[PDB]
Write an enzyme that holds these catalytic residues in place. Structure first.
Site, PDB file in Angstrom:
ATOM      1  CE  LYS A  47      -4.678  -6.770  -2.163  1.00  0.00           C
ATOM      2  NZ  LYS A  47      -3.952  -6.230  -1.068  1.00  0.00           N
TER       3      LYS A  47
ATOM      4  CG  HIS B 247      13.586  -6.212  31.830  1.00  0.00           C
ATOM      5  ND1 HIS B 247      13.318  -7.520  31.778  1.00  0.00           N
ATOM      6  CD2 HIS B 247      13.938  -5.467  30.761  1.00  0.00           C
ATOM      7  CE1 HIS B 247      13.753  -7.699  30.744  1.00  0.00           C
ATOM      8  NE2 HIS B 247      14.151  -6.422  29.933  1.00  0.00           N
ATOM      9  CG  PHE B 248      11.614  -4.266  39.873  1.00  0.00           C
ATOM     10  CD1 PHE B 248      12.465  -3.931  40.578  1.00  0.00           C
ATOM     11  CD2 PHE B 248      10.398  -3.909  40.052  1.00  0.00           C
ATOM     12  CE1 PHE B 248      12.339  -3.030  41.506  1.00  0.00           C
ATOM     13  CE2 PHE B 248      10.151  -2.652  40.895  1.00  0.00           C
ATOM     14  CZ  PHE B 248      11.129  -2.462  41.840  1.00  0.00           C
ATOM     15  CG  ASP B 249      17.098  -0.853  36.368  1.00  0.00           C
ATOM     16  OD1 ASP B 249      17.634  -1.828  35.870  1.00  0.00           O
ATOM     17  OD2 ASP B 249      17.422   0.042  36.432  1.00  0.00           O
TER      18      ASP B 249
ATOM     19  CG  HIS C 139      -2.074  -1.217   1.192  1.00  0.00           C
ATOM     20  ND1 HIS C 139      -1.823  -2.112   2.393  1.00  0.00           N
ATOM     21  CD2 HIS C 139      -2.805  -1.232   0.233  1.00  0.00           C
ATOM     22  CE1 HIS C 139      -2.956  -2.973   1.651  1.00  0.00           C
ATOM     23  NE2 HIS C 139      -3.470  -2.426   0.716  1.00  0.00           N
TER      24      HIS C 139
END
Length: 124
Positions: free
Chosen positions: A41, A119-121, A12
């Site tokens: 198509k 993620h926990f930093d 497109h």
């Protein structure tokens, strides 16, 4: 495998031109973007705007998709587009299309993933 986003660009996006330059635009573009590789198509639209402007539509007007899903977005402004529609003589491998230029709002389905914690930093 080609990604869903890449496949949308391939089918497109045509930011290289401001509009269809001739009546054979579709015949040429349906072929060069591989939309006539194994079958013709039937209907396809090309968008003559920057990739940034087309991607921005995903943050514009939320509307329902044709199939009832809720992730379609409609552009706030009209955009230069070209509708490619098969002619009656079109017969694979000799596909053939009518080219029609228009300035209309586009409606596209958008996919992505929300920006969330992964993620926990640390804490402070």
């Amino acid at each position: 495998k080609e990604t869903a986003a890449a496949k949308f660009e391939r089918q497109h996006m045509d930011s290289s031109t401001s509009a269809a330059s001739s009546s054979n635009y579709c015949n040429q573009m349906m072929k060069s973007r591989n939309l006539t590789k194994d079958r013709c198509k039937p209907v396809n639209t090309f968008v003559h705007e920057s990739l940034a402007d087309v991607q921005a539509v995903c943050s514009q007007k939320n509307v329902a998709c044709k199939n009832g899903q809720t992730n379609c977005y409609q552009s706030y402004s009209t955009m230069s587009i070209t509708d490619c529609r098969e002619t009656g003589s079109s017969k694979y491998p000799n596909c053939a299309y009518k080219t029609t230029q228009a300035n209309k709002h586009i409606i596209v389905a958008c996919e992505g993933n929300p920006y969330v914690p992964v993620h926990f930093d640390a804490s402070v």
